[PDB]
Amino acid sequence: FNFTEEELSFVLYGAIASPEHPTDLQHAISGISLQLPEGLCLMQTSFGDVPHFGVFCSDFIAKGVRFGPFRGRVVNASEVKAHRDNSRMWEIFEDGHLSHFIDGKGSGNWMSYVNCARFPKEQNLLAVQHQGQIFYESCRDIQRNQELLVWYGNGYEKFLGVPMNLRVTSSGSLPATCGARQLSKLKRFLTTLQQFGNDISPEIGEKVRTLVLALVNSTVTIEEFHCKLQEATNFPLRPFVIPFLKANLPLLQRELLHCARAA
Amino acid sequence: VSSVPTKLEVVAATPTSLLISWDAPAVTVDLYFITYGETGGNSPVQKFTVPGSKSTATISGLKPGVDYTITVYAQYYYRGWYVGSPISINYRT
């Protein structure tokens, strides 16, 4: 694979502009009765002649407003296939452990169209589990024409962006590497990883930037990447990362590859 | 034009759980947030929701003896989604 840093930055940090002013962010699913509340709207744009929706704020949303509960099929933990994205699933915990997933795909409820945050600056929603269900809570004042984008809130034990557990008010098990919202988790891991590097050092952050791009381009194998990254950053990754990358890296590559050329 | 609730009252039910009550504000309410956490404590503050239909909730799993700050406030829609200002009380079970 021979991708440029700019086309990587596009998939991790970019957005498509519409005929208007507001832009759609990229959780560009579909790689090859809404009951929508007041103040919100569903917004289609086109990407590769493939329809792509997003939930936008038509008016105003104050910080601390909570929407939900998320609605969808109940997927038992065993029947979720591997090498798949599962763009619209949430992990449901009971008593400290993974119970089941809740699949919003094809629900037709408006919340299943809210895309994920790939990094915090574009994030205005927090995913929050209460009782058995998922809610989205605004973490910022949401202004008109700004897109609603969610990520796993605190109350989820996370490592560099990826959630491992339901943060305790004690239990001990990680969700298996094959699960919900995998491509979004991968993006969130890579961006968080990049920011993590920059905070240590400019030279170290630049090393990671090239090291990640080389990984995305399969120039370097994951275990090769893992070692060199730990060498360059002087910081140990959790064991889940290698199988996580082996499972989900080919999703970012497939999407990255999926780009139209001008006309 | 008012959003803040009134007459919030707290009663102990078990040494670790309270029954709280309030009466709705002027505005039409979607959610009430209920919030509890140790007064003057470095402990985090917890919050759940009850629908506008309800004007009572039960808080549970509290430390007996320790006083908590309970807070309720309304989430409404008025030319935008807003969360109002809260009513507060402190109470040791």
Numbering used by the authors:
A (entry chain A): 2 to 33, 53 to 189, 195 to 288
B (entry chain E): 1 to 93
Published text:
Prdm14 is a sequence-specific transcriptional regulator that plays key roles in promoting primordial germ cell (PGC) specification and safeguarding pluripotency of embryonic stem cells (ESCs). As a member of the PRDM family, Prdm14 contains both a zinc-finger array, responsible for sequence-dependent DNA binding, and a PR domain that is related to the SET domain (Su(var)3–9, Enhancer-of-zeste and Trithorax). Monobodies are small binding proteins (~10 kDa) generated from combinatorial phage-display libraries built on the antibody-like scaffold of the tenth human fibronectin type III domain (FN3).
To overcome this problem, we designed a fusion construct of Prdm14 and Mtgr1 in which the two proteins were linked with a ten-residue linker (GSSGSSGS), a common strategy for stabilizing heterodimers. The addition of Mb(S4) readily led to crystallization of Prdm14-linker-Mtgr1, and we determined its structure to a resolution of 3.06 Å through single wavelength anomalous diffraction (SAD) phasing using selenomethionine-labeled crystals. As expected, the monobody bound exclusively to Prdm14, burying 604 Å2 surface areas, a similar interface size to other monobody/target complexes. The Mtgr1-Prdm14 interaction interface buries 2180 Å2, a large interface but still within the observed range for high-affinity protein–protein interaction interfaces with a low nanomolar KD value. We also note that His211 and Ala212 in the pre-SET region of Prdm14 occupy the S-adenosyl-L-methionine (SAM)-binding site and thus, at least in the context of the presented structure, preclude the binding of this cofactor necessary for methylation.
